[PDB]
Amino acid sequence: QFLRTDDEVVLQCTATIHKEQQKLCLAAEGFGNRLCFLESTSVPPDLSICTFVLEQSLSVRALQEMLANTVHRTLLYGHAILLRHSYSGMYLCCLSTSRKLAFDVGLQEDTTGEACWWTIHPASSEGEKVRVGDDLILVSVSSERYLHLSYGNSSWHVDAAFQQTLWSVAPI
Numbered sequence: 001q002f003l004r005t006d007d008e009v010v011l012q013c014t015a016t017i018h019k020e021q022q023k024l025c026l027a028a029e030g031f032g033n034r035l036c037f038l039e040s041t042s043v044p045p046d047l048s049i050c051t052f053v054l055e056q057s058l059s060v061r062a063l064q065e066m067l068a069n070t071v072h073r074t075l076l077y078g079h080a081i082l083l084r085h086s087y088s089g090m091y092l093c094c095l096s097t098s099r100k101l102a103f104d105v106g107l108q109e110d111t112t113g114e115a116c117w118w119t120i121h122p123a124s125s126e127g128e129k130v131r132v133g134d135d136l137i138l139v140s141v142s143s144e145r146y147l148h149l150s151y152g153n154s155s156w157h158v159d160a161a162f163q164q165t166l167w168s169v170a171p172i
Contacts, residue, residue, distance in 0.1 A: 001131065001132040001133075002074055002075075002129045002130060002131050002132065003054075003074070003075045003130040003131070003132055003134075003169065003171075004054075004072050004073065004074045004075065005054045005055075005056070005057045005072055005073045005074070005075065006053070006054060006055070006072045007053065007054045007072075007171055008051050008052070008053055008086065008171060008172075009051070009052050009053075009054060009169050009170060009171050009172075010025050010026075010047075010050055010051060010052070010169070010170060010171075010172060011025065011026040011052065011147075011167050011168075011169050012024065012025050012026075012041070012167065012168040012169070012170070013026075013038075013149050013165055013166065013167050013168065014166075014168075015038075015149060015151075015156050017151060022040055022041070022042075023040075023041045023042070023168075024038040024039065024040060024041065024149070024156055025038065025039050025041060025044045025050045026038060026050070026052070026092075026158060026167075027039050027044070027046070027049045027050045028049060028085055028088065028092075028106065028107050029049050029087070029088065030085070030087055030088025030089070030090060030107065034090075034095075034106035034107050034108065035095075035104055035105065035106040036092070036105050036106055036107070036158050037157065037158070038149075038155075038156050038157065038158055048086070048087055049085075049087050051085075051086045051087075052083040052084065052085060052086065052092060053083065053084045053085075053086055054075070054081060054082070054083060055082045055083070055084045055091075056081065056082035057073060057075050057076075057079050057080070057081050057082070058079060058080050058081075059078070059079055059080070060078070060079075060080055060119065060141070063080045063114075063117060063141065067112075067113075067114070070112075074129055074130070075120060075129070075130040076127055076128065076129060076130065077120060077121060077122050077125065077126045077127060077128050077130060078119065078120070078121070078126040078127060079119065079120060080117045080118065080119045080120075080141050081117070081118055081119075081120055082111065082116060082117060082118075083116075083118065085107055088107055089109070090107035090108055090109045091107060091108055091109065091110075091111055091116040092105070092107065092116065092118070093105070093106060093107065093108045093115045093116040094115050094116075094118075094140035094142050094143050094145060094160045095108075095115070095160075099159070101161075101162065102145070102148065102150065102159040102160060102161040102162070103140075103143055103145055103159060103160040103161075104159060104160070105147065105158050105159055105160055113142070114140075114141040114142040115140070115141075115142040115143075117140075117141035117142070118138045118139065118140060118141065118147065119138070119139045119141060120136050120137070120138060121136065121137035121138070121139060122134070122135075122136075122137070123135040123136070123137070123166055132170060132171070133170070135166040135167065135168060136166065136167045136168075136169055137164050137165075137166065137167075138167060140160050143160055145160035145161055145162065146160065146161055146162070146163060146164040146165060147160065147165060147167065148160060148161035148163060148164065148165045149165040
C-alpha cells in the first residue's frame with residue numbers, strides 16, 4: 001500500500017527518554033490557542049483532533065509557479081504537501097514564533113503562502129512513491145526547518161527545528 005492524497009492520516013513519532021519509549025500523535029484544537037501538541041497512545045485518548053487530511057500534493061516547482069504567478073493522487077518523495085486539520089479546517093503550518101532557535105507549529109486558515117507547505121523526505125530516493133509503513137521527514141517550505149519532536153520540562157512538544165524527526169504517518 002502506498003500513501004495517496006485526499007486521505008485521513010495520523011502523524012505519529014517515537015519518543016524515548018529514560019529508556020521509556022512511547023508513540024505520540026500530532027494534534028491540535030481550533031479554539032483559542034493555535035499551537036499543536038502531542039498525545040500519548042494506547043490509540044490516543046482523543047482521536048478527532050488527531051486527524052489530518054492530505055488536501056494537496058505538488059512539486060516544489062509547481063508550488064512556486066502558482067505563488068509567483070499571483071505576485072486521490074499519490075505522494076512522491078520531494079513533493080510538498082498540505083495538511084488540513086479535520087476538526088478546525090485550518091492548516092498545519094510553520095509559525096514565526098519561537099520555542100528558542102526553533103519555530104512553533106500550529107494551525108492557520110490562510111492556505112496561501114509557503115508556511116503551510118511541507119516537503120516530504122525519505123528516512124534514507126526522491127521521486128519514488130511513498131509506501132505506507134515508511135518513515136517520513138517533513139521540511140517546512142517557508143522556514144526550511146524540520147517538523148521536530150522536542151522535549152521540555154515535563155513534556156514532549158513539536159516544533160520546527162534544525163534537527164529532524166521521523167514520522168509514522170498512517171491512515172485511520
